[PDB]
Amino acid sequence: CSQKPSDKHLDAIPILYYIIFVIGFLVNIVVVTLFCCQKGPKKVSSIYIFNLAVADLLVLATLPLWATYYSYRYDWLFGPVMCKVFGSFLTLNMFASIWFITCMSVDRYQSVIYPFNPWQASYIVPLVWCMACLSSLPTFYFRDVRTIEYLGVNACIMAFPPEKYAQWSAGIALMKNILGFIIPLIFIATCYFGIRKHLLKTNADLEDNWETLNDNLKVIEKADNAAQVKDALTKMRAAALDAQKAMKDFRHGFDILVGQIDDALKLANEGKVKEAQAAAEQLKTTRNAYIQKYLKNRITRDQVLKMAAAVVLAFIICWLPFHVLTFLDALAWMGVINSCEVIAVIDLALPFAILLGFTNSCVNPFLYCFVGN
């Protein structure tokens, strides 16, 4: 079949593209004048934020243009050569905007394994833009204005050779999935899977030990027998012997903590409950000095991880909707999907799933620049 995608349903999308435009703009004009005003100088991490925030600002440039196309029920006003331009130029920046997020996330991973001048930015920066064009020639070619069969309207459409329209319009939809989502996300997610892997190795999980210390003290603090007090302390010793294994002096804090439990064990093997009790009253001040140290260090490991997550969420939250509907749109083109309740809704949804992909352009500035200042 072939639906009337025009309805009362897409009355929203003209105005959102404006919110996304004006909001996505101010936010991204800031990011440019930061780097534009003082520069890196020669800062590799801040050079990728620019090309991104630039590509984002070119995506967002054209949105009031496409705000027409959806306002005029898919009636393109600007004639068939202008349709080829902005169509290709949009795909160009989209693919570049995404592939710079790809870079940023690989940079941020290397920023974490080897925390220590720009040189290769000369390849990576052009090489992206270049492929963003080579990836956008198919779109320049097939894009064109056609009086569309059903609507009775002159629409800006990917006009393949009618003979095999199904074939082209599918393979093309697959090349979005692969080149715009499946690969970029292999790069972006496994990076998150490197920070998680190297902020677990570059560290220790001592809370398994710390709970023991905090548990067995409240036992000692309200003990009745010498049995319990000897019990609590023999566990609190093994806790500190592991914790010990794990520059920082933190290791001496566990030398001291052993040499405060051994002494109190010695009291508790005599049968001195009040003595042992008051002996662990002192432990608490060792533990308190060193628990407090541990939490200031783990909040530095915390803010690292939460931001490496928020990067891959912002991505998936904006570019999964569009790339699912594209994979269905594409399966339907092959002929795997037939039911037109589906194809009604695929071509009633892609409008919104698209607008989301452009929200990410509005968002990267908050993730990549606005954090830290």
Epitope: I256, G259, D263, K266, E275, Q277, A289
Partner: antibody
Framework: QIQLQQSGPELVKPGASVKISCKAS????????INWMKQRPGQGLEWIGW????????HYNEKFKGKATLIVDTSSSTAFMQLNSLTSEDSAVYFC????????????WGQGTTLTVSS | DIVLTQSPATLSVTPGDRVSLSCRAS??????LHWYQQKSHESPRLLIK???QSISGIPSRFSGSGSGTDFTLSINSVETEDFGMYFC?????????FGAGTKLELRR
Amino acid sequence: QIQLQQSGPELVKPGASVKISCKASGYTFTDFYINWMKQRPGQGLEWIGWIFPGSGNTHYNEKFKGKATLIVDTSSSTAFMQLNSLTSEDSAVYFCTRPVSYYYDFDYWGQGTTLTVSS
Amino acid sequence: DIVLTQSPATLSVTPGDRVSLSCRASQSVSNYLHWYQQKSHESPRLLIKYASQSISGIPSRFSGSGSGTDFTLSINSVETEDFGMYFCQQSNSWPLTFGAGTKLELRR
């Protein structure tokens, strides 16, 4: 009653070392944590370190580590604080004190060893 | 190191008046705070432990209060004997830290 007797004022000359004492009587020595303080006539106190006689195991304040040891004799039931490279800045009073404890009625101070440095 | 900031330094009481002594904390010290009295530079007398816990021997008129980051020692009626230093001490974490202290002196 529990008592702490500290050896009385030493006469000391710049750069020389010291060994201030603290006889402990009333309680069985090897069971309780013993601190050491400092005080300057007009100021508030400054904690030097704890020691547990039953082990000999210690900890100190950073400021004092460079220039303050602690040491214990079991048989005699007496505690020492060995200071060194002394100068006008150690012209102060010094207390060995069993610290405050929830499970006990009282804490237990010395009575203060007055230390003056001058050639 | 946990600084312990006593206020004020001097304070001219009258035998009969109630008085409050501020002892603030640069960071959290919990209830692990102890007050002290000292008259003639001698070994100081433990008045209150764990902020409000009463000491055997100390008269009723001394009462402690607050918790965590801000503590006070309310003497419910000062007498002639009460003059001298008062020092607050955190038992929270090494290094143990004292107040610079509040000197009480008679009004006239």
